[PDB]
């Protein structure tokens, strides 16, 4: 029962290093380990991670090996190095959450009562999905469905911790996408937001197409019981707005007349002084 | 670059700070300030700060590793 | 410099009051036999 | 057999781990052995680093307790690589970035084990905001007496920028191995505004009632700036212009109170209108 | 069944679709609100009623075609606006 | 403070004994005070002694008697009820 | 660094003064125990961490010792 | 001395509760243990041991270790409840063995096939067709339930060999509840 | 049970402790001027979760030793001193021990 | 605008160097030696810069 | 004996100071003290 999960920038680098280290000697295209954090409240700040040997058999995708002995040994050493970290879940790449998901969650649940698995990719940036968090709740069903694995999603956001924010600041020190160049950045933000909305709507469209063609089961219970209501408040007020959008004029009064007047007068005065100075200097030179 | 630099200079007046007293003033960009410790120091003064609120005595903060009037 | 306010018998630990800084619990250096060090005498405690 | 202007490359994760471990125990002092690869005679690279539980009287030869040293390096190879131990964390909370006689005694043994190993010093207190005080050190050879000035050489190449610091001069000095951070493109793809980009929150209109209050709060004082500008425009009437126009203090108007205000007002009042009108057509 | 634009309906419609009296219509709508199936509002002098929903129901494949079409039109419009902004602002975007 | 705390200490230790605070006129003087209060530590010491005296029930047996060559200046609190009460 | 406990809170807690007149709160009581404690008892603390290491035997300064 | 590691597939099936060799059957799987490998380390003190269950798709209860206390402790709690699994059970052990240290150690899987299996006919393709190129060794122990001689299981060793192999042997101790001497003496290993 | 009492024993051997100080003013919604018992003064604020409650211009806070952000509340100490004029005993007296008045 | 990126840049570096102490000199000894008196601590025989 | 039971407030002397500020501080401190409980009545004796 977690409202949100926050990842410390050290963990993302941890996963990226793991993927590079293995893939330099690997081709299975899946690095999987178990992380540690502090389940202080509804929020769970995963703050560090390690590795664990993991091999999986492509036949049936159901034969594998996770060295729980490695689990205990690694955790013991990390406990000696610091006692404030508790094992709270695992991590793995390969956005294609493979079959042995609930199985591994079962195996690792013998070290936590509320284990939460956050999936970390090593690639995309166009959208804003650096990671997503999943939980293994086996609530049987509602309505009339049979039981199943029924993994679930927990909201996530990449966090920070002082003395590490400094590290990242230095490590980047080039893009510096802060309020620098504020007007240009605001326009780029409006463009990027439109692109993101396009992408999300397109994903919804693809799912709707796939469900209508019958390829996938109709998730009446929750998937579209919310899409309909969302479709139900695409603000359509187009009768009194014709007069409710004179607040645009209220903004425009300032943002046009006052700003343009001030900048025009200032520029005129600056030109006046510069020309006067240069003319006097040239005249006096000879 | 300039915008980043202004942000960086602004980022010096935050965080924990230590209180002291503006004992006396010297050439601009510099002054002498007391301290909560009681070991009156010599400090450099941030330019962006005001000038009409620097009373002969006053409560001012100082950087922990710089003891600069921020 | 520092004084000694106790010398735990059969326990090598000693307690000293330096002067104005604070009190402490100290170990006796190997170079000095415990018998040569008593209660109330002035000891040459080192820094660090 | 001679040093030069040599570059030590610390991985991004390595730097992050150094800083986190240092700050976790700031009041005390910490120690952490370094794993890396001895690239070549002028390139020592450390890929990742690992910490050693805070035991003993402090940073000393006790951090190398074999029982713990062997078992980590072991299990670590099982998954990843054996990069041989190359250096150590160390940490001086409020003591600049110096090396003391005990530290020299320690690093002497590590030098013996290796031939060119390095000793890092990461300051967890002073280094904040936008400062990294991570300086790398090596033990000057005991044959100081008379030799080519230092083992630095510096005759091979001119890389010497970022000359020696201040405190190290006061304390034991004369190496200061130059440090250069490697950053894979992917490693910075994340750790980027992935750390704070926005996600889709640009198409937010901002509290409208708040906007109409901020705008008045700004324009009302723009009026005062205008009054001051008039006053300062009557000035320059040939009394002592060259000197006076520069000696007049008070945040000259069209540089800190009439220009910045116009620039902020423009940006805010335009972004608001753009967002409003964009949403007027995105949603139907 | 109304196309989400003219949700304001008239008591005549409720009566003809509910075989209840004109007078009783207001009570029926008030009961609906009270139970909590709609969240509109009731007005008289205009002889109309204003609705707004929070209780959605099940659907069928044919009814999903309308939703798909609405989404497709919305996506086309969003793409158009994004392209317009990107093209016009191209001078200052970078 | 440590001196007084201990002095009334080691009295429960070696339970049978009686304490005599000679020249009490100095350790406790009438409740004059300094606006600076930097030289007011003696008042803290006297209050500590008073507290010790208060925290004492006739079940325990460690008596205290003291002399004051000038009863005039003694703080009119060390004579309240259960602290030094009998006068000779 | 010899010290004492002054205001045991239990909100399991402590408030330690030192011979350096440094009043410092403690997050967790020392590696000792919550019963072997009382409002004032010489207990050692670490040089910087300021935990509560082994308690101490009540010893009297010479100034008061030489008064029997 | 020992050019081999050790992993064991200790059955856990629902049928494992039965009087066929002793108290409650499995009570005997536990029986060899204390010799099921006690004998294997009765070898140079550098042998390696393991443990793998085979019910409910089977988990792993021990990672290769020159220790036995852990394997015994896990054995104490092996409650039998569920249908036996194989093929997948053997492949899990195979992977675990691949993750063995001291490459000098050869592989060995001692299969305590008790309760009946559901394996199809030509399971050999995955059951044995690999161990050759992987130079693996598998041993089969039939805890009774020898349905029609379980030629299906015998075919595993049959696929083994091809010239030389079989490990020690696929010994099916008779349903006579004699003991584990049959798993103590019979195994020359 | 011994292992249990040892695990927490070693685990607690990490805590570093705070500095006991009394807040003085309320500079901003996130900047509160705070002093220390020793005497030096500082400027700090809540950590990330403190209720930002009353914290009147007097109260006990245990600031951190590195960042110094206020960490926790703390009630008044009342060290044995002039600080204990409080002897409200509610109801254990009657005219049963009067002097005839 | 290059002026700004310097008149505001160099100020940061020259604002992060350890400050100075304030003291009272007494009896300048032989040239290149003085006897200052710091506030909390005792008198130090400080040197003299080249300026 | 009444429903006050709170009488004690041993005399009143500590409110003596050299400026009205400290007296106002002490009196509001005691007033809040009284406000703490049910009707509180403050003994004012011990004056010279
Ligand atoms: Zn050091």
- Which of these, B7, B4, B19, lies nearest to B48 by C-alpha position? B7
**Residue D127 and residue D134 in contact, taking contact as beta carbons nearer than 8 Å:** yes
Residue D198 counted as domain residue: no
- Which of these, A54, A111, F28, D137, lies nearest to H96 by C-alpha position? A54
Is A65 in contact with H59 (Cβ distance < 8 A)? no
Q: What is the distance between the alpha carbons of residues H8 and F73, in angstroms, rounded to a whole number? A: 93
**Residue J22 and residue B40 in contact, taking contact as beta carbons nearer than 8 Å:** yes
Residues 6+ apart with CB under 8 A from F29: F42, F46, F73, F74, F75
Q: What is the distance between the alpha carbons of residues J17 and J19, in angstroms, rounded to a whole number? A: 6
Identify whether residues D39 and D172 lie together within a single domain: yes
Q: What is the distance between the alpha carbons of residues D136 and D121, in angstroms, rounded to a whole number? A: 6
SS3 of D38, please? strand
* Touch of D by I (3+ CB pairs closer than 8 Å): yes
Identify whether residues D154 and D252 lie together within a single domain: no
Size of interface C-G (CB pairs under 8 A): 28
Nearest-5° Cα angle at D109, D108 to D113: 120
Containing D60, the helix (H) or strand (E) segment is none
Residues 17-76 of I with CB under 8 A from G: 17-20, 36-38, 62, 72, 74-75
How far apart are the CA of C31 and the nearest CA of chain G, in angstroms?
A: 24
Q: What is the DSSP letter of D175?
A: -
**Residue H60 and residue A65 in contact, taking contact as beta carbons nearer than 8 Å:** yes
Domain boundary, last residue among D192, D214, D236:
D192
- D225 burial type by CB count under 10 A (0-12 exposed, 13-18 middle, 19+ buried): buried
- Two tokens at C20? 């104005």
Q: How far is CA D130 from CA A162, D134, D277, in A?
A: 12, 12, 39
Beta bridge mates, H65: H49
- Which of these, I51, I58, I67, I65, lies nearest to I34 by C-alpha position? I58
Residue B34 Rama label (left phi>0; alpha psi -120 to 50; beta): beta
CA atoms lying within 13 Å on the CB side of residue D161: 2
Identify whether residues D213 and D88 lie together within a single domain: no
Containing F51, the helix (H) or strand (E) segment is helix F41-54
DSSP chain A: --SEEEE-HHHHHHHHHHHHHHHTT--S---EEEEEE---SSEEEE-EE----EEEETTTT-EEEE-HHHHHHHHHHHHHH-SS-EEEEEEE--SS--STTHHHHHHHGGG-SS-EEEEE-SS--SSS-SEEEEEE-----STTPPP---EEEE-EEE---TTTHHHHHHHH-SS--SSSSHHHHHHHHHHHHHHHHHHHHHHHHHHHHHHHTTSS---TTTHHHHHHHHHH-S----SSHHHHT-HHHHHHIIIIIIHHHHHHHHHHHHHHHHHHHHHHHHHHH-
How far apart are the CA of G25 and the nearest CA of chain D, in angstroms?
A: 15
Identify whether residues D132 and D184 lie together within a single domain: yes
How far apart are the CA of I16 and the nearest CA of chain D, in angstroms?
A: 7
Beta bridge mates, B45: B69
Containing H7, the helix (H) or strand (E) segment is strand H7-10
Contacts of I91 in chain K (CB under 8 A): 5
Q: How far is the CA of D135 from the centre of ligand 1 (A)?
A: 13
- Which of these, B41, B52, B56, lies nearest to B69 by C-alpha position? B41
What is the number of residues in chain E? 94
**Residue D226 and residue D258 in contact, taking contact as beta carbons nearer than 8 Å:** yes
Residues 6+ apart with CB under 8 A from E72: A205
Q: What is the distance between the alpha carbons of residues I19 and I34, in angstroms, rounded to a whole number? A: 11
* Touch of F by G (3+ CB pairs closer than 8 Å): yes
Q: What is the distance between the alpha carbons of residues H9 and H32, in angstroms, rounded to a whole number? A: 13
- Which of these, B3, E67, G39, lies nearest to A184 by C-alpha position? B3
**Residue G60 and residue C39 in contact, taking contact as beta carbons nearer than 8 Å:** no
Annotation: binding site of K: 45-46
- DSSP strand pairing (G3-5 vs G15-18): antiparallel
Tokens 């996963």 belong to residue: A15
**Residue A49 and residue A93 in contact, taking contact as beta carbons nearer than 8 Å:** no
Contacts of I67 in chain A (CB under 8 A): 162
Q: How far is the CA of D99 from the centre of ligand 1 (A)?
A: 6
- Two tokens at E42? 């009731």
Identify whether residues D106 and D222 lie together within a single domain: no
- Provide the CA H140 distance to its chain's centre, in angstroms: 6
- Interface residue B3 vs chain A (CB under 8 A): yes
- Interface residue I86 vs chain K (CB under 8 A): yes
**Residue H96 and residue H104 in contact, taking contact as beta carbons nearer than 8 Å:** no
Q: What is the distance between the alpha carbons of residues A122 and A129, in angstroms, rounded to a whole number? A: 11
Q: How far is the CA of I11 from the centre of ligand 1 (A)?
A: 25
Residues 6+ apart with CB under 8 A from I99: none
Q: What is the distance between the alpha carbons of residues D239 and A114, in angstroms, rounded to a whole number? A: 80
Residues 6+ apart with CB under 8 A from A210: A216
- Provide the CA A12 distance to its chain's centre, in angstroms: 11
Identify whether residues D132 and D20 lie together within a single domain: yes
Residues spanned by the domain of D237: 203-277
Q: How far is the CA of H137 from the centre of ligand 1 (A)?
A: 55
Beta bridge mates, E88: none
SS3 of K14, please? coil
Domain boundary, last residue among D167, D192, D217:
D192
* Touch of I by K (3+ CB pairs closer than 8 Å): yes
Contacts of G61 in chain F (CB under 8 A): 2-3, 6
Beta bridge mates, A152: A135
Q: What is the distance between the alpha carbons of residues B70 and B17, in angstroms, rounded to a whole number? A: 9
Q: What is the distance between the alpha carbons of residues I71 and I62, in angstroms, rounded to a whole number? A: 6
In terms of CA atoms, which chain B residue is nearest residue D126?
Answer: B65
Identify whether residues D52 and D151 lie together within a single domain: yes
SS3 of F33, please? coil
Q: Long-range pairs for E9-16 at CB < 8 Å and ≥24 separation?
A: E9/E48, E9/E49, E9/E51, E10/E47, E10/E48, E10/E49, E11/E47, E11/E48, E11/E49, E14/E49
Annotation: binding site of K for Mg(2+): 45-46
Is B16 in contact with I39 (Cβ distance < 8 A)? no
Q: Say how many Å lie between the first and final Cα of chain J, rounded.
A: 34
SS3 of D278, please? helix
Contacts of I38 in chain G (CB under 8 A): 21-23
- Two tokens at D1? 């057999």
Contacts of K33 in chain I (CB under 8 A): 86
SS3 of H154, please? helix
How far apart are the CA of G23 and the nearest CA of chain C, in angstroms?
A: 13
Secondary structure string (H, E, C) spanning C1-48? CEEEEEECCCCCCEEEECCCCCEEEECCCCCCCHHHCCCCCEECCCCC
Q: What is the phi/psi pair of residue A30, to 5°?
A: -160, 115
Number of domain units in chain D: 2
**Residue D75 and residue A74 in contact, taking contact as beta carbons nearer than 8 Å:** yes
Identify whether residues D162 and D217 lie together within a single domain: no
- Two tokens at A75? 């955790």
What is the number of residues in chain D? 284
Q: How far is the CA of D51 from the centre of ligand 1 (A)?
A: 16
Is G61 in contact with F6 (Cβ distance < 8 A)? yes
Q: What is the distance between the alpha carbons of residues E18 and E40, in angstroms, rounded to a whole number? A: 19
Residues 6+ apart with CB under 8 A from A170: D15, D130, D132, D181
Q: What is the distance between the alpha carbons of residues D217 and D219, in angstroms, rounded to a whole number? A: 6
> Helices D260-282 & E61-88, crossing angle to 10 degrees?
150
Identify whether residues D16 and D117 lie together within a single domain: yes
**Residue D110 and residue D117 in contact, taking contact as beta carbons nearer than 8 Å:** yes
How far apart are the CA of E75 and the nearest CA of chain A, in angstroms?
A: 6
Question: Strand (E) positions, chain B?
Answer: 17-21, 24-25, 30-33, 41-44, 59-62
Q: What is the phi/psi pair of residue F50, to 5°?
A: -60, -45
- Which of these, D31, D25, D9, D194, lies nearest to A11 by C-alpha position? D194
Residues 6+ apart with CB under 8 A from B45: B28, B29, B30, B31, B68, B69
* Touch of I by F (3+ CB pairs closer than 8 Å): yes
CA atoms lying within 13 Å on the CB side of residue H100: 27
In terms of CA atoms, which chain D residue is nearest residue A121?
Answer: D190
Q: How far is the CA of D141 from the centre of ligand 1 (A)?
A: 19
- DSSP strand pairing (J36-38 vs J23-25): antiparallel
In terms of CA atoms, which chain D residue is nearest residue B65?
Answer: D126
Q: What is the DSSP letter of D231?
A: H
Resolution of the entry in angstroms? 3.8
**Residue B4 and residue A180 in contact, taking contact as beta carbons nearer than 8 Å:** yes
In terms of CA atoms, which chain G residue is nearest residue F3?
Answer: G64
Q: What is the DSSP letter of H69?
A: H
Identify whether residues D150 and D219 lie together within a single domain: no
Other Cβ atoms less than 10 A from the Cβ of F30: the count is 10
Is E77 in contact with D278 (Cβ distance < 8 A)? no
* Radius of gyration from C-alpha coordinates of chain J: 17
Identify whether residues D157 and D104 lie together within a single domain: yes
Contacts of A30 in chain H (CB under 8 A): none
Q: What is the distance between the alpha carbons of residues K9 and I88, in angstroms, rounded to a whole number? A: 7
Other Cβ atoms less than 10 A from the Cβ of A171: the count is 23
D103 is in an annotated binding site: yes
Q: How far is the CA of I20 from the centre of ligand 1 (A)?
A: 29
> Sign of dihedral through CA atoms H24, H25, H29, H35?
positive
How far apart are the CA of F2 and the nearest CA of chain G, in angstroms?
A: 9
Identify whether residues D115 and D220 lie together within a single domain: no
Tokens 């006046």 belong to residue: A272
- Provide the CA A84 distance to its chain's centre, in angstroms: 26
Residues 6+ apart with CB under 8 A from H66: H41, H45, H46, H47, H48, H49
Is J22 in contact with B12 (Cβ distance < 8 A)? no
**Residue B4 and residue B52 in contact, taking contact as beta carbons nearer than 8 Å:** no
């Amino acid at each position: 029962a977690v409202q949100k999960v926050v990842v410390h920038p050290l963990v993302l680098l941890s996963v990226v290093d793991h993927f590079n280290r293995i893939g330099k000697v690997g081709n299975q295209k899946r690095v999987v380990g178990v992380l540690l954090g502090s389940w202080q409240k509804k929020v769970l700040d995963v703050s560090n991670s390690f590795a664990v040997p993991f091999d999986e058999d492509d036949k049936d995708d159901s034969v594998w090996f996770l060295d729980h002995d490695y689990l205990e040994n690694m955790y013991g050493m990390f406990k000696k190095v610091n006692a404030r970290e508790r094992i709270v879940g695992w991590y793995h790449t390969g956005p294609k959450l493979h079959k042995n998901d609930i199985a591994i969650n079962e195996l690792m649940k013998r070290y936590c009562p509320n284990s939460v698995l956050v999936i970390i990719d090593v690639k995309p940036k166009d959208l804003g999905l650096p990671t997503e968090a999943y939980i293994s709740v086996e609530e049987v069903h509602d309505d009339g469905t049979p039981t199943s694995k029924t993994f679930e999603h927990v909201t996530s956001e990449i966090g920070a911790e002082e003395a590490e924010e400094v590290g990242v600041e230095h490590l980047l020190r080039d893009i510096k996408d802060t309020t620098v160049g504020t007007l240009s950045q605001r326009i780029t933000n409006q463009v990027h937001g439109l692109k993101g909305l396009n992408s999300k709507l397109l994903d919804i469209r693809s799912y709707l197409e796939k469900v209508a063609t019958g390829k996938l089961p109709i998730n009446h219970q929750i998937i579209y019981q919310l899409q309909d209501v969302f479709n139900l408040l695409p603000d359509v007020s187009l009768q009194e707005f014709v007069k409710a959008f004179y607040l645009k004029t209220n903004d425009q009064m300032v943002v046009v007349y006052l700003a343009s007047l001030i900048r025009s007068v200032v520029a005129l005065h600056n030109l006046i002084n510069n020309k006067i100075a240069n003319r006097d200097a040239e005249k006096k030179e000879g | 670059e300039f915008l980043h630099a202004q942000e960086e200079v602004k980022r010096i007046q935050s965080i924990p700070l230590v209180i002291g007293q503006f004992l006396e003033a010297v050439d601009q960009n510099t002054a002498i300030v007391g301290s909560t410790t009681g070991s009156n120091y010599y400090v450099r003064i941030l330019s962006t700060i005001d000038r009409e609120l620097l009373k002969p005595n006053a409560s001012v903060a100082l950087h922990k590793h710089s003891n600069a009037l921020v | 410099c520092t004084k000694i306010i106790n010398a735990d018998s059969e326990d090598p630990k000693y307690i000293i009051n330096v002067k104005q800084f604070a009190k402490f619990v100290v170990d006796l250096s190997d170079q000095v036999a415990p018998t040569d060090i008593e209660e109330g005498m002035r000891v040459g405690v080192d820094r660090n | 057999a001679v040093d030069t202007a040599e570059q030590v490359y610390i991985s991004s994760l390595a730097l992050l781990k150094m800083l986190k471990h240092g700050r976790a125990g700031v009041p005390m002092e910490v120690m952490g052995l370094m794993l890396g690869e001895f690239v070549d005679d002028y390139t020592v690279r450390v890929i990742d680093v690992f910490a050693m539980p805070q035991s003993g009287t402090g940073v000393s030869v006790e951090a190398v307790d074999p029982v713990f040293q062997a078992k980590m390096l072991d299990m670590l190879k099982q998954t990843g690589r054996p990069e041989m131990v190359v250096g150590w964390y160390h940490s001086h909370p409020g003591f600049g970035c110096w090396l003391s006689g005990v530290d020299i005694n320690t690093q002497q043994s590590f030098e013996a084990l290796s031939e060119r190993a390095v000793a890092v010093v990461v300051d967890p207190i002073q280094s904040v905001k936008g400062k990294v005080v991570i300086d790398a050190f090596r033990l000057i050879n005991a044959n100081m007496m008379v030799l080519g000035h230092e083992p630095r050489q510096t005759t091979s190449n001119l890389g010497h920028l970022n000359k020696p610091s201040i405190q190290a001069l006061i304390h034991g000095l004369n190496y200061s191995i130059t440090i250069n951070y490697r950053k894979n493109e992917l490693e910075q793809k994340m750790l980027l505004n992935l750390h704070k980009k926005s996600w889709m929150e640009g198409l937010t209109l901002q509290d409208y009632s708040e906007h109409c209050k901020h705008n008045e709060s700004v324009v009302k004082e723009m009026l005062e700036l205008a009054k001051n500008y008039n006053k300062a425009v009557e000035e320059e009437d040939k009394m002592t212009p060259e000197q006076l126009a520069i000696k007049n203090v008070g945040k000259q108007d069209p540089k800190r109170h009439l220009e910045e205000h116009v620039d902020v007002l423009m940006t805010s009042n335009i972004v608001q209108c753009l967002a409003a009108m964009l949403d007027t057509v995105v949603f139907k | 069944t109304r196309p989400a634009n003219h949700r304001q309906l008239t008591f005549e419609e409720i009566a003809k679709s509910a075989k209840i009296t004109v007078n009783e219509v207001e009570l029926l709508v008030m009961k609906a609100l009270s139970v909590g199936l709609v969240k509109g509002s009731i007005d008289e002098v205009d002889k109309r009623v204003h609705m707004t929903w929070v209780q959605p129901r099940v659907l069928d494949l044919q009814q999903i075609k309308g939703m798909k079409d609405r989404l497709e039109f919305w996506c086309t419009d969003v793409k158009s606006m994004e392209m317009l902004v990107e093209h016009q602002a191209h001078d200052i975007l970078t | 403070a440590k001196l007084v705390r201990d002095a009334f200490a080691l009295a429960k230790e070696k339970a049978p004994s009686i304490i005599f605070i000679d020249e009490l006129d100095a350790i406790g003087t009438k409740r004059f005070d300094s606006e600076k209060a930097g030289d007011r530590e003696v008042q803290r010491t006297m209050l500590e002694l008073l507290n010790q005296l208060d925290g004492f029930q006739p079940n325990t047996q460690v008596k205290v008697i003291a002399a004051t060559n000038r009863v005039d200046i003694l703080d009119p609190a060390l004579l309240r009820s259960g602290r030094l009460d009998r006068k000779i | 660094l010899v010290s004492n406990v002054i205001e045991l809170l239990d909100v399991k807690c402590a408030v330690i003064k030192t011979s350096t007149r440094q009043t410092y709160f403690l997050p967790v009581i020392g590696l000792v125990d919550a019963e072997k404690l009382k409002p004032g008892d010489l207990v050692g603390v670490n040089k910087d961490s300021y935990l509560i290491l082994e308690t101490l035997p009540t010893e009297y300064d010479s100034r008061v010792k030489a008064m029997e | 001395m020992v050019l081999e590691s050790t992993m064991v597939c200790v059955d856990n099936s629902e049928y494992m509760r039965n009087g066929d060799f002793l108290p409650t059957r499995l009570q005997a799987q536990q029986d060899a243990v204390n010799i099921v490998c006690h004998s294997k380390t009765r070898s140079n003190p550098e042998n390696n041991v393991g443990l793998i269950t085979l019910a409910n798709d089977c988990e792993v209860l021990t990672t290769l270790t020159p220790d036995t206390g852990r394997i015994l402790s896990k054995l104490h709690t092996v409650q039998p409840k569920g249908k036996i699994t194989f093929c997948t059970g053997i492949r899990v052990a195979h992977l675990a063995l691949k993750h063995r240290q001291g490459k000098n150690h050869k592989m060995r899987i001692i299969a305590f096939v008790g309760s009946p299996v559901e394996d199809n006919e030509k399971d050999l393709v995955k059951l044995a067709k690999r161990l050759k190129k992987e130079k693996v060794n598998v041993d089969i122990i039939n805890f009774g339930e020898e349905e029609v001689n379980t030629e299906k299981l015998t075919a595993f060793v049959n696929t083994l060999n091809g010239k030389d192999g079989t490990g020690s042997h696929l010994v099916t101790v008779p349903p006579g509840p004699s003991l584990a001497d049959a798993l103590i003496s019979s195994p020359i290993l | 049970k011994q292992y249990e009492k040892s695990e927490n024993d070693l685990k607690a051997l990490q805590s570093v402790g705070q500095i006991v100080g009394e807040v003085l003013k309320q500079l901003t919604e996130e900047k509160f001027i705070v002093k220390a018992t020793n005497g030096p003064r500082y400027v700090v604020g809540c950590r990330r979760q403190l209720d930002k409650s009353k914290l009147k211009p007097g109260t006990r806070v245990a600031l951190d030793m590195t960042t110094l952000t206020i960490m926790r509340y703390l009630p008044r100490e009342v060290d044995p001193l002039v600080y204990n004029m409080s002897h409200e005993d509610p109801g254990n007296v009657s005219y049963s021990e009067i002097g005839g008045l | 605008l290059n002026a700004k990126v310097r008149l505001l840049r160099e100020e940061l570096q020259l604002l992060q160097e350890q400050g100075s102490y304030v003291g009272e000199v007494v009896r300048a000894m032989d040239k290149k030696k003085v006897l200052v008196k710091v506030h909390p601590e005792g008198k130090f025989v400080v040197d003299v810069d080249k300026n | 004996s009444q429903l006050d039971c709170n009488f004690l407030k041993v005399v009143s002397s500590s409110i003596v100071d050299k400026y009205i500020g400290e007296s106002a501080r002490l009196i509001r401190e005691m007033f809040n003290y009284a406000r703490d409980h049910q009707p509180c009545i403050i003994f004012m004796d011990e004056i010279d």
